[PDB]
Amino acid sequence: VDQATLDKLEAGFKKLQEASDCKSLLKKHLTKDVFDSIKNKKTGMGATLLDVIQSGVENLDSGVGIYAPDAESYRTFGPLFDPIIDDYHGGFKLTDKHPPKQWGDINTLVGLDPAGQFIISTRVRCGRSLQGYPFNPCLTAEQYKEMEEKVSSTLSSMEDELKGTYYPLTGMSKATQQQLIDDHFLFKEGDRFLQTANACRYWPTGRGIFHNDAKTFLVWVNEEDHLRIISMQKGGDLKTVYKRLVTAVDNIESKLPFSHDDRFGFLTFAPTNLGTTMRASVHIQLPKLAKDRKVLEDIASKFNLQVRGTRGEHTESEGGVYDISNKRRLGLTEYQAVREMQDGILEMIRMEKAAA
Ligand SMILES: Nc1ncnc2c1ncn2[C@@H]1O[C@H](COP(=O)(O)OP(=O)(O)O)[C@@H](O)[C@H]1O
Ligand SMILES: NC(=[NH2+])NCCC[C@H](N)C(=O)O
Ligand SMILES: [Cl-]
Ligand SMILES: [Mg+2]
């Protein structure tokens, strides 16, 4: 590590202290004992502790605040990642090791809201990393194009329900883009947390979205992760949604080599998406229980569920519509993950029905 870097790190660490109102896991776990212990480390690709915490330092409002420039970062800066991963994922020790991929008995899933008075839509996604490629911050503009090439090709061989067209962000009309974002299909453009983590370089080169005409199956290309395999649709038919995602992933996995860590499961750019990389969500309306986003969040937390705005994380709820999903992704199976969301939603719906 050079000198200019340490200057910004020492300056960054101090900033986290003078932010009495900062509640990010970064501040909560980057002790002076942890800071000094690794701030002088660098990875084979030149990633430093600054490339890891820069986003959380510049955005005190972050909930986590860090990212892994390359797979090696997860271990080079273990002292910092390890405790953050443990806290977030509901308890993941140092000796712990994520379990083997297990979709589970899909047949055991049920409809989330029959009467259809609360649930608007259901969605489940996973994240994958192409072997041979580092994470965003370590990518060259040429690598974004290479990766875009590989993924688009592999997806052109999707058949039946999973058959669709790849739409590059480069050349996409502002109208088409804005609509796909507003319809909750396409990832938003320019996220401050990602920008400051240098995850958006050369934008929009190599970025794109693949999806079948129904747009119930989608693959985000080069946003936060190399790939994001999405399955979504209106209603609470979690069974179908999950089943579809499973089909897609198993198929895609037989064609593209994805990075998998003996301990962290499937590797991702961010620590909250490790392991199963699964975020099973629903856009739900709970008028009585959501009489204060805060009281709703306290309820959901008891079920290991997370609450997000209608347009995604770091956004507000629009017209009572909230994004509730399983928070944990590492330390449990795909099946267990999707189940925490299922079980959690079923109870909250009940609590809502009995609510005064
Ligand atoms: N259950 C859902 N129904 C419809 N859209 C969803 C659903 N869950 C999330 N979304 C949409 O996914 C997009 C990305 O949201 P974000 O919070 O970044 O989640 P992620 O990165 O895990 O996919 C946003 O448009 C959000 O509105
Ligand atoms: N997509 C994600 N990694 N979301 C969770 C972290 C988001 C942001 N870096 C924060 O810590 O607030
Ligand atoms: Cl994260
Ligand atoms: Mg996202």
From 24, 54, 64, 281, the mutation candidate for ligand 2 (largest count of ligand atoms within 8 A of CB) is: 64
- Of the candidates 133, 121, 64, which has an alpha carbon nearest to the alpha carbon of residue 235? 121
Please name the residue whose Cα sits nearest to atom 12 of ligand 2. 62
- Residue 29, token pair as written in the block: 């776990």
Reported residue count of the chain is: 356
Find out whether the beta carbon of 9 lies less than 6 Å from any atom of ligand 2: no
- Of the candidates 159, 245, 146, 164, which has an alpha carbon nearest to the alpha carbon of residue 205? 146
> Taking a C-beta distance cutoff of 8 angstroms, is the pair 338, 280 a contact?
yes
> Taking a C-beta distance cutoff of 8 angstroms, is the pair 208, 221 a contact?
yes
Q: Give the C-alpha separation, 200 to 224, whole Å.
A: 8
Find out whether the beta carbon of 313 lies less than 6 Å from any atom of ligand 2: yes
Please name the residue whose Cα sits nearest to atom 4 of ligand 2. 272
Q: Give the C-alpha separation, 52 to 76, whole Å.
A: 11
The ligand 1 atom nearest the CA atom of 224: 21
Please name the residue whose Cα sits nearest to atom 10 of ligand 2. 62
> Taking a C-beta distance cutoff of 8 angstroms, is the pair 135, 67 a contact?
yes
- Residue 252, token pair as written in the block: 């895609």
The 3-state DSSP class for residue 281 equals strand
Q: Give the C-alpha separation, 16 to 268, whole Å.
A: 25
Q: Mind listing the domains of the chain with CATH numbers?
A: 1-94 (1.10.135.10), 97-356 (3.30.590.10)
From 191, 193, 330, the mutation candidate for ligand 2 (largest count of ligand atoms within 8 A of CB) is: 193
Q: Give the rounded distance of the alpha carbon of 306 from its chain centre.
A: 12
Find out whether the beta carbon of 289 lies less than 6 Å from any atom of ligand 2: no
Find out whether the beta carbon of 277 lies less than 6 Å from any atom of ligand 1: no
> Taking a C-beta distance cutoff of 8 angstroms, is the pair 341, 327 a contact?
no
Q: Residue 38 carries which DSSP code?
A: H
b/e sequence 79-103, b meaning 16+ C-beta within 10 Å:
bbbbbbbbebbeebeeebebeebeb
Query: Which segments of the chain are extended strands (E)?
Result: 119-128, 164-168, 208-212, 217-221, 227-234, 260-261, 265-266, 279-285, 305-308, 321-326
Q: Give the C-alpha separation, 346 to 61, whole Å.
A: 31
Please name the residue whose Cα sits nearest to atom 6 of ligand 2. 64
Q: What is the resolution of this structure in A?
A: 2.3
Find out whether the beta carbon of 312 lies less than 6 Å from any atom of ligand 2: no
How remote is the CA of residue 356 from the centroid of ligand 3, in Å? 37
Find out whether the beta carbon of 61 lies less than 6 Å from any atom of ligand 2: no
> Taking a C-beta distance cutoff of 8 angstroms, is the pair 52, 67 a contact?
yes
Find out whether the beta carbon of 215 lies less than 6 Å from any atom of ligand 1: no
- Tell me the C-alpha to C-alpha distance, in Å, between residue 92 and each of 206, 248, 284, 344: 34, 29, 29, 21
Q: Which residues does 317 contact at the CB level (< 8 Å), separation at least 6?
A: 290, 293, 309, 310
Q: Which ligand sits nearest to residue 318's alpha carbon?
A: 1
Find out whether the beta carbon of 314 lies less than 6 Å from any atom of ligand 1: no
Find out whether the beta carbon of 272 lies less than 6 Å from any atom of ligand 2: yes
- Of the candidates 277, 303, 304, which has an alpha carbon nearest to the alpha carbon of residue 101? 277
Find out whether the beta carbon of 283 lies less than 6 Å from any atom of ligand 1: yes
C-alpha dihedral (224, 345, 26, 192), degrees to nearest 10: 40
Find out whether the beta carbon of 223 lies less than 6 Å from any atom of ligand 2: no
